[PDB]
């Protein structure tokens, strides 16, 4: 077979050309450009609220855009909308499949999604004329587990999956309008851009791919990790993103440079990152770990600012609110803690 | 405390109702036995779920035997890698592992140089020595038993195991497959492997599952009391 081998020779030529082009763009590291910048001090965040009521391991949380309600999914088959200011529970949504791996609050707040090992993104109408939360749609086109779902609108939702694909859905139609078919490992994380036109998706092939929601294409590809990318989060600019992997390093990539800018690693950390978020300015990089605690990274100097240590098991989910006020941090010890 | 509003009080009361329902659901799910049903592609898991309980995703099979509710989660339809979702079943009571032991000579459909029993052995090695099932006991099933005792009259076990020094009778080869599967245990002091042969039995496989699950529940009761 000459044609497939000469075209993979062309592919290796393209990889060498892209590598040397983004090496020609690499002149000065971000850690040496922000060396003049006064570092943030010892970040001391206390557990302000602790959210009790999940019986099994919490696998995902998602903040509402009102920065007060958050949904959390745990594998006792329960989707709980929490009120964070009052600690009390707004809804408990029993799930048709107990094996939920992801949850997403709609930015309107009218809907919430969940999904996992049933390969179905169930979408739950929070605001019904009845007082129950009912399923508004069940998105049943993925063949692997759903690892991340993310609401774009009330009617659009992009879902990561373990079938090496992401998929943009239409909720009133129930079918995937777009499929993102570029990854070769299980896609484990999503992060929508703030303008919601792009999203990055990290996968188990150690690569993050930047997609275009409208065009349906893989815009850029980001290979900087050694192990499976479990977590991804856009910078609040929308022009950068951080990836959390099982390599125990967080790497911040840039969309405009198409390369890794930083490596948020520590030699005393051997266990992978499950969750990555940013603060409201992107100065802080909240990263959840399997060593039972979140770590607060200076996202411009790669120096670990603080440690959110309150969890008796692996930190599995964390989100910073849209006003940057709090960091919820859910974990496998069946509690979410609100940090500030 | 009277620092709350009239609607804050009723929201707190709604949350305590939600708490009551959550506690009752957690207590209901605590009585149920979760079983992670595993095995190879042609290992006879569906025979097990149709003689024990009498699209995409994972399949749960609820059944009741001697006033225990069991829940058997078949994960055979997850072509994705097990590393990213096998921790979901950390805390499962036992692992039903079905092995078609008549597939000692047969090879796979995706790779025809590896035989199916050695693939089941590598899957059993990955599952048993996993970091999530260090104390989760394995109820191992050697399923197609009469087909095995016919096929060893038609084809020896040296096709599968070259280091085998026994003959082609049923009890020798069956005890050899059972010990070669139980030697894949690298814990051996934290988790127990329960082994059975399930060819044509009437309500005996679910009795074996109930007895092995009862031993697991006794050991977890003793660990809940520190003993």
């Amino acid at each position, epitope marked *: 077979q000459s044609e497939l081998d000469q075209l993979r020779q062309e592919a290796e030529q393209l990889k060498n050309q892209i590598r040397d082009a983004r090496k020609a763009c690499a002149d000065a590291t971000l850690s040496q450009i922000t060396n003049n910048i006064d570092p943030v001090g010892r970040i001391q965040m206390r557990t302000r609220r602790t959210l009790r009521g999940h019986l099994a391991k919490i696998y995902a949380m998602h903040w509402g855009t009102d920065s*007060r*309600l958050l949904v959390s999914a745990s594998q006792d088959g329960k989707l709980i909308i929490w*009120d964070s*200011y*009052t600690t009390n529970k*707004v*809804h408990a949504i029993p799930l048709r499949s107990s094996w939920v791996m992801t949850c997403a609050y709609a930015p309107s*707040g009218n809907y919430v999604a969940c999904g996992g090992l049933d390969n179905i993104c169930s979408i739950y109408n929070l*605001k019904t*004329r*009845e*007082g*129950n939360v009912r399923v508004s749609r069940e998105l049943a086109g993925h063949t692997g587990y759903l690892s991340c779902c993310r609401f774009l609108d009330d009617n659009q939702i992009v879902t990561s999956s373990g079938d090496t694909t992401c998929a943009l859905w239409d909720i009133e139609t129930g079918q995937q309008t777009t499929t993102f078919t570029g990854h070769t490992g299980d896609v484990m994380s999503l992060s929508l851009a703030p303008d919601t036109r792009l999203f990055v998706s990290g996968a188990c092939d150690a690569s993050a791919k930047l997609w275009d929601v409208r065009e349906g294409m893989c815009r850029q590809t980001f290979t900087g990790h050694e192990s499976d990318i479990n977590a991804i989060c856009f910078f609040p600019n929308g022009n950068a993103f951080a990836t959390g992997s099982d390599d125990a390093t967080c790497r911040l990539f840039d969309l405009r440079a198409d390369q890794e800018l930083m490596t948020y690693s520590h030699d005393n950390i051997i266990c992978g990152i499950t969750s990555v978020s940013f603060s409201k300015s992107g100065r802080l990089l909240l990263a959840g770990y399997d060593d039972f605690n979140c770590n607060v990274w200076d996202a411009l100097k790669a120096d670990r600012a603080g440690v959110l240590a309150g969890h008796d098991n692996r930190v599995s989910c964390l989100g910073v609110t849209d006003d940057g006020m709090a960091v919820a941090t859910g974990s496998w010890d069946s509690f979410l803690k609100i940090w500030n | 405390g009277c*620092t709350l*509003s*009239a*609607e*804050d*009080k*009723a*929201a707190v*009361e*709604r*949350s*305590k*109702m939600i708490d009551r329902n959550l506690r009752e659901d957690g207590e209901k799910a605590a009585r149920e036995v979760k079983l992670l049903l595993l095995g190879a592609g042609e290992s006879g898991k569906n025979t097990i779920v149709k003689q024990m309980k009498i699209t995409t995703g994972i399949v749960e099979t609820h059944f009741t035997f001697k006033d225990l509710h069991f829940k058997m989660f078949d994960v055979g339809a997850q072509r994705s890698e097990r590393k990213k979702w096998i921790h979901c079943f950390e805390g499962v009571t036992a692992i039903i592992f079905c092995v078609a032991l008549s597939d000692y000579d047969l090879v796979l459909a995706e790779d025809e140089e590896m035989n199916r029993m050695h693939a089941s052995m590598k899957l059993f090695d990955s599952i048993c020595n996993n970091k999530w099932f260090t104390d989760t006991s394995i109820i191992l099933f050697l399923n197609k038993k009469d087909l095995f005792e016919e096929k060893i009259k038609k084809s020896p076990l040296t096709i599968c195991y070259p280091e085998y020094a026994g003959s082609n009778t049923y009890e020798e080869a069956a005890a050899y497959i059972q010990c070669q599967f139980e030697d894949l245990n690298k814990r051996k002091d934290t988790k127990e492997i329960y082994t059975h042969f399930t060819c044509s039995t009437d309500t005996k496989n679910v009795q074996f599952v109930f007895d092995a699950v009862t031993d697991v529940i006794i050991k977890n009761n003793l660990k809940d009391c520190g003993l």
Partner: single-chain antibody
Amino acid sequence: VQLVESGGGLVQPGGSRKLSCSASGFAFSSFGMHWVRQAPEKGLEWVAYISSGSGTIYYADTVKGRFTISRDDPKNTLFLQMTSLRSEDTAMYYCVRSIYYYGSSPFDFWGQGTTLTVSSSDIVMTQATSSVPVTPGESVSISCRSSKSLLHSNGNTYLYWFLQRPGQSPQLLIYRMSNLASGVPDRFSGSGSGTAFTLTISRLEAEDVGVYYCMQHLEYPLTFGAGTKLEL
């Protein structure tokens, strides 16, 4: 969603009457249910309240002791046992759906109540106006004054605006002083600070006329305002 109250009719005084409300079309066990009176050609008046799961029962001090409110969450039925029926208890008794979580709209569905006829501290909500004639298209500002700051410490102001059209049960317009209810068109708006409140209707129509009640939900009993009637 339907709340169909049952019972009522002529009741001679001193006798009991059980007012049933068969609920239908919603998750009845999740809703805290109210009973709200409306004496003939008078304003709304809250009678009783039972919580979701019957854990908290409040009554008006007019009916505290004589009336008992109860639920049957399997049958989806609300009761009001009215012992020792005085002659000021003649009214139309509406049964009100209400749910309380963060961002909920309580008092949002009212039943078409039963007319019960009998033979013979509290936050005072003062709507100083009582009848405003407006043509369709005028921008009305119905006001309401509270005898206590309805602004609670947490940030929201528990003021509830209702519209009782003639021959109709009351309908929630504005919940918690600024938030429009679910079926309510973006022509009603609420504003105010603590005690002085206003509901600004813009581009009024023929169905927007009717009686307009403000109601506090800061403190039990839930006192209504005397309604501002709108005509053409």
